[PDB]
Amino acid sequence: SMSVKKPKRDDSKDLALCSMILTEMETHEDAWPFLLPVNLKLVPGYKKVIKKPMDFSTIREKLSSGQYPNLETFALDVRLVFDNCETFNEDDSDIGRAGHNMRKYFEKKWTDTFK
């Protein structure tokens, strides 16, 4: 509350560390469904169904331009990429499997870097 604070966590490396995680996600072999924004002209139903599209290139641009106020807002966009994927793709499809794999990969790196 006012004039009552928990000890200050060192957040000075968060930006660099999220960048590193994001590089690791970008270079994973199962990243291909997520690298670029879904083409809303060419994929029927996507525009109407997925209210907030998200992809790795859009996260990279937000990250590089100071549009994440803290590491939680960064994690929320990464998870949105996988939540979108589950909304639109059967579990038993190449893309549906890619999303589960990437979500796992991310959640481990997240825990190991920050928890």
Distance (Å, rounded) from C-alpha 113 to C-alpha 111? 6
The length of the chain, given as a count of residues: 115
**Eight-class DSSP state of 35:** S
Q: What is the spatial distance between Cα 82 and Cα 39, in angstroms, rounded to a whole number?
A: 17
38 to 7, 14, 19, 49, 58: CA distances (angstroms): 42, 28, 22, 12, 11
What resolution in angstroms, rounded to 1 decimal? 1.7
Contact partners, residue 32, CB within 8 Å, separation at least 6: 98
Taking each helix axis as running N to C, give the angle between helix 71-88 and helix 56-64, from 0 to 180 degrees, rounded to the nearest 10. Answer: 170
CATH number (3.40.50.740, 3.30.420.40, 1.20.950.20, 1.20.920.10) of 1-115 reads 1.20.920.10
